[PDB]
Scaffold this active site. Structure first.
Site, PDB file in Angstrom:
ATOM      1  N   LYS B 209      16.996   0.505  -8.862  1.00  0.00           N
ATOM      2  CA  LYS B 209      17.130  -0.914  -8.655  1.00  0.00           C
ATOM      3  C   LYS B 209      18.505  -1.491  -8.978  1.00  0.00           C
ATOM      4  O   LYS B 209      19.284  -0.940  -9.755  1.00  0.00           O
ATOM      5  CB  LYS B 209      16.013  -1.617  -9.396  1.00  0.00           C
ATOM      6  N   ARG B 243       6.798   4.151 -11.033  1.00  0.00           N
ATOM      7  CA  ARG B 243       7.087   4.388  -9.644  1.00  0.00           C
ATOM      8  C   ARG B 243       8.554   4.769  -9.411  1.00  0.00           C
ATOM      9  O   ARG B 243       9.463   3.923  -9.500  1.00  0.00           O
ATOM     10  CB  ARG B 243       6.795   3.121  -8.899  1.00  0.00           C
TER      11      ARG B 243
HETATM   12  C1  B52 Z   1      11.759  -3.074  -3.353  1.00  0.00           C
HETATM   13  C2  B52 Z   1      11.164  -1.686  -3.545  1.00  0.00           C
HETATM   14  C3  B52 Z   1      12.170  -0.735  -4.246  1.00  0.00           C
HETATM   15  O1  B52 Z   1      11.769   0.434  -4.584  1.00  0.00           O
HETATM   16  O2  B52 Z   1      13.389  -1.108  -4.451  1.00  0.00           O
HETATM   17  C4  B52 Z   1       9.800  -1.745  -4.219  1.00  0.00           C
HETATM   18  N1  B52 Z   1       8.694  -1.570  -3.448  1.00  0.00           N
HETATM   19  N2  B52 Z   1       7.346  -1.564  -3.896  1.00  0.00           N
HETATM   20  C5  B52 Z   1       6.264  -1.344  -2.943  1.00  0.00           C
HETATM   21  C6  B52 Z   1       7.025  -1.732  -5.243  1.00  0.00           C
HETATM   22  N3  B52 Z   1       5.742  -1.719  -5.677  1.00  0.00           N
HETATM   23  C7  B52 Z   1       5.453  -1.919  -6.983  1.00  0.00           C
HETATM   24  N4  B52 Z   1       4.158  -1.885  -7.365  1.00  0.00           N
HETATM   25  N5  B52 Z   1       6.412  -2.107  -7.909  1.00  0.00           N
HETATM   26  C8  B52 Z   1       7.721  -2.136  -7.600  1.00  0.00           C
HETATM   27  O3  B52 Z   1       8.568  -2.333  -8.473  1.00  0.00           O
HETATM   28  C9  B52 Z   1       8.136  -1.950  -6.193  1.00  0.00           C
HETATM   29  C10 B52 Z   1       9.548  -1.953  -5.693  1.00  0.00           C
HETATM   30  O4  B52 Z   1      10.497  -2.117  -6.483  1.00  0.00           O
END
Ligand code: B52
Ligand code: B52
Lengths: 263, 263
Positions: B209, B243
């Site tokens: 991020k 994640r």
């Molecule tokens: C914007 C994208 C990324 O990886 O930069 C992102 N996508 N998604 C689906 C996410 N889902 C959940 N639960 N948490 C998250 O922090 C998150 C994200 O940060």
């Protein structure tokens, strides 16, 4: 939180603005040499310069007594001349410490916390340098690991203060990997913040250590991610210094940790 | 501490034994394709298999509405057939979610926490799947970041529960990087443990991020060490899931963290 700076002759280390990275220096001795050879001193200086460039704040250099001086003294001389960062001498011997400061070292790093050779505390008081008192002992019989470590560290503070070391030149270390079983190392990690009640800055040395191997089941050179975990946990629990091999990586994790915890 | 397991149709995830790693799936669409092409589905499956092999516990797959279904449905079908791990569908649309579970997905991952399309909570209640409610909003006017995030998350729990979602299928997420300034992201990180009072498992998504970039001043593909720091801090503060992109590394840091904190 710290109302002083670490005073290291020509350099000053601020204890409040960031976690300080102590770079472990590579000392592959020249077969045929006593100490002093171009190949070993040069690999040493190049390694120190690289660690300087990757974010190290201190270079830690380590090296029978007359031999250890011959090996380590040439390296302190070269590195301090050529790399503008404080040097700690990694020894528990008062004679080697004397020599090493004479040769250019700024900080003593004693893996025996002034217990192997109490005279080293006097060396320290005399040159007015920071001394790192690491938790160690000749056995593993703990009534209560943490309470005992704190007793033990405290016995080192006594020896240091009694020989005239000022509070501002005391730094403590849990001695992870020494006189502790793998589960004891994890427990010391879990409870590191308790060392803070003693009132001194704390340095953590966990880099590439065997308990990381024990957990991850990974050999020495596959332990970067687990070293990282121990550094992060240590910063979260209030350590002021970390002693690491992989300066580039650890130095980035430290800096991210610092921003999150608000250091 | 958790007196239940995450029930995901054919798989069960224990919330107590380890931090669970959700692998972010690479979805490079085939130009000329609607969705379904051999090159994209195959790169997808190979990527999922690799993440399975590096320690991932969940595969997270993400993909205008009729188009999104066409793209993501072929991938859920291939991956669930060929990789024996739960799949979460990364969508905020009730229609896509319906389809994706139909196609094989086990968990919903809603970056809008049932606020974009409240009907998704009903989808969720109906198929009886875990839903991840991420903190998000259309503005950044915080009276008190943490208190507001908790209010907001709590508004998502209301929508979920009101549509019939059982407590055991609620997972929350601070939504790091969404509707927050870089200093707000660091502050949410600093105070993550407060989400625990809500009583639900927490997933942290900080991988690669921008706030890590903001701190380290490093581009997207130089953020592995700073992602690591955020994962460690998140595990120390009680998150149950992370994640991540870099499954091999993060999965090692997680496991070392778990051993230290006693999970
Ligand atoms: C914007 C994208 C990324 O990886 O930069 C992102 N996508 N998604 C689906 C996410 N889902 C959940 N639960 N948490 C998250 O922090 C998150 C994200 O940060
Ligand atoms: C055994 C060795 C190693 O890196 O494996 C080691 N050497 N020295 C000099 C150390 N010094 C301090 N202060 N702390 C330490 O943890 C420490 C160590 O772990």
């Amino acid at each position: 939180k710290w109302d002083y700076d670490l005073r290291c002759g020509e350099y000053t280390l601020n204890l409040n603005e960031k976690t300080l990275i102590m770079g472990i220096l590579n000392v592959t001795p020249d077969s045929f040499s006593d100490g002093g050879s171009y190949n070993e001193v040069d690999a040493a200086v190049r390694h120190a310069k690289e660690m300087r460039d990757e974010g190290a704040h201190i270079i830690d250099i380590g090296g029978s007594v007359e031999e250890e001086i011959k090996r380590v003294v040439p390296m302190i001389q070269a590195v301090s001349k050529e790399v503008k960062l404080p040097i700690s001498i990694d020894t528990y011997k008062a004679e080697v410490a004397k020599q090493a400061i004479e040769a250019g070292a700024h900080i003593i790093n004693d893996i025996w916390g002034a217990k192997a050779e109490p005279k080293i505390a006097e060396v320290a008081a005399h040159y007015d340098v920071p001394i790192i008192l690491m938790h160690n002992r000749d056995n593993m019989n703990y009534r209560n690991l943490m309470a005992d470590m704190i007793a033990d560290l405290y016995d080192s503070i006594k020896i240091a203060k009694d020989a005239g070391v000022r509070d501002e030149n005391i730094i403590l270390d849990p001695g992870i990997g020494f006189a502790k079983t793998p589960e004891q190392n994890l427990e010391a990690m879990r409870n590191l913040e308790q060392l803070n009640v003693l009132g001194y800055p704390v340095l953590l040395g966990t880099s590439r250590k065997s308990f990381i191997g024990h957990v991850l089941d990974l050999p020495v050179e596959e332990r970067l991610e687990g070293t990282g975990a121990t550094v992060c946990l240590g910063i979260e629990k209030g350590c002021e210094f970390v002693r690491v091999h992989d300066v580039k990586e650890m130095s980035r994790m430290a800096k991210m940790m610092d921003a999150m915890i608000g250091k």
